[PDB]
Amino acid sequence: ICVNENGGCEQYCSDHTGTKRSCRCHEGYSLLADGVSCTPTVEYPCGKIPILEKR
Amino acid sequence: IVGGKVCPKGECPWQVLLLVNGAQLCGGTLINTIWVVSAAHCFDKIKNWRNLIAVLGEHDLSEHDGDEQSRRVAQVIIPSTYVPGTTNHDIALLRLHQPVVLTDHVVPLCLPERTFSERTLAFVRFSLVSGWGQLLDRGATALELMVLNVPRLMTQDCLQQSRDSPNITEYMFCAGYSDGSKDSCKGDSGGPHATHYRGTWYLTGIVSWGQGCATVGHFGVYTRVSQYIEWLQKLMRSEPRPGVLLRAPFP
Numbered sequence: 001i002c003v004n005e006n007g008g009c010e011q012y013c014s015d016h017t018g019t020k021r022s023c024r025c026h027e028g029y030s031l032l033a034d035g036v037s038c039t040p041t042v043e044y045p046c047g048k049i050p051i052l053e054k055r
Numbered sequence: 056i057v058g059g060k061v062c063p064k065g066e067c068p069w070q071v072l073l074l075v076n077g078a079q080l081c082g083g084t085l086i087n088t089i090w091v092v093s094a095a096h097c098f099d100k101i102k103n104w105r106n107l108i109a110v111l112g113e114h115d116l117s118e119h120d121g122d123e124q125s126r127r128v129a130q131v132i133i134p135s136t137y138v139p140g141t142t143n144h145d146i147a148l149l150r151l152h153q154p155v156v157l158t159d160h161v162v163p164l165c166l167p168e169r170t171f172s173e174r175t176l177a178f179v180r181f182s183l184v185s186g187w188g189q190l191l192d193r194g195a196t197a198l199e200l201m202v203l204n205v206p207r208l209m210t211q212d213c214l215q216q217s218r219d220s221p222n223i224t225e226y227m228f229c230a231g232y233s234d235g236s237k238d239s240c241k242g243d244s245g246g247p248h249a250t251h252y253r254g255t256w257y258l259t260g261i262v263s264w265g266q267g268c269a270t271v272g273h274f275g276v277y278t279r280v281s282q283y284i285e286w287l288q289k290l291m292r293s294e295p296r297p298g299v300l301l302r303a304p305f306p
């Protein structure tokens with residue numbers, strides 16, 4: 001599942017026993033109930049540009 | 056950077072400036088508050104290890120605006136497989152003496168997971184390369200941080216599209232242009248090759264080498280960071296060691 005279109009994940013993808021897929025997030029992010037989206041949990045998450053994010 | 060533009064202030068917040076005795080040495084990428092990834096070849100000619108400084112929040116070299124944060128480099132970690140004066144395994148992991156403070160001008164770049172980097176990030180065509188390197192071949196270096204958008208090539212196309220030539224290993228990748236108009240240069244060494252994916256930027260490459268600055272028939276060569284994720288992660292979890300330079304087994 002992960003090999004194709006990142007398994008639908010916004011960030012990290014883990015394949016499981018069967019056609020089971022868990023999306024994961026980098027530190028400073030949490031997974032939303034859609035199970036694919038990552039939302040920041042900190043003021044300065046990695047890979048985001050504050051001056052652009054505040055626009 | 057040849058043929059780029061001035062990165063607007065705060066738009067490359069993970070860019071590191073490395074200094075030796077106050078002189079411009081290399082670039083780097085902040086990946087959290089205490090760790091910077093750069094190129095191993097940046098440290099080939101260092102003798103004064105205690106004079107290594109990392110500057111975060113830097114933009115314009117002629118002015119202090121208060122957003123700059125300077126830190127002593129407590130440790131430089133290089134793979135055992137890297138040989139000074141050569142191209143392969145061109146990566147360094149730097150531990151700052153004290154954490155940097157995250158602000159609008161100082162933000163880490165995401166060091167991605169290997170699988171995600173190999174199966175997803177490797178297929179994003181364009182990525183950003185940055186530094187205060189030379190603006191032209193045999194020209195002066197930049198006073199303001201420059202950025203360039205470069206396309207990544209499959210290693211087969213790099214070889215057939217190019218004109219005593221060093222090989223391109225599984226620990227490298229080509230990115231850029233063959234017409235001599237746009238390139239990363241030697242003063243950009245160690246800087247980030249950053250890839251955007253679904254609203255977030257990730258570290259995919261390190262400015263490593265080439266066959267002359269913006270040379271016709273030749274592409275930029277970047278360290279393939281995906282090959283070092285595990286090596287980097289294991290070292291970030293390890294206790295500091297006496298001495299500035301550390302050679303660490305690779306893999």
Ligand SMILES: CCc1cc2ccc1CCOC(=O)Nc1ccc(S(=O)(=O)C(C)C)c(c1)CN(C)C(=O)[C@@H]2Nc1cccc(C(N)=O)c1
Nearest residue numbers: 096097099140141142239240241244263264265266267268
């Ligand atoms: C991987 C190493 C490398 C690096 C490059 C050229 C060839 C080689 C392979 C052979 O080994 C060396 O020459 N080692 C070496 C060691 C220390 C220094 S240094 O100056 O001490 C350090 C502080 C940067 C330099 C070189 C200076 N120098 C020429 C470079 O840094 C140059 N960098 C570079 C980066 C991006 C694009 C281009 C491009 N388009 O040409 C060139």
Ligand SMILES: [Ca+2]
Nearest residue numbers: 115116118119
């Ligand atoms: Ca400044």
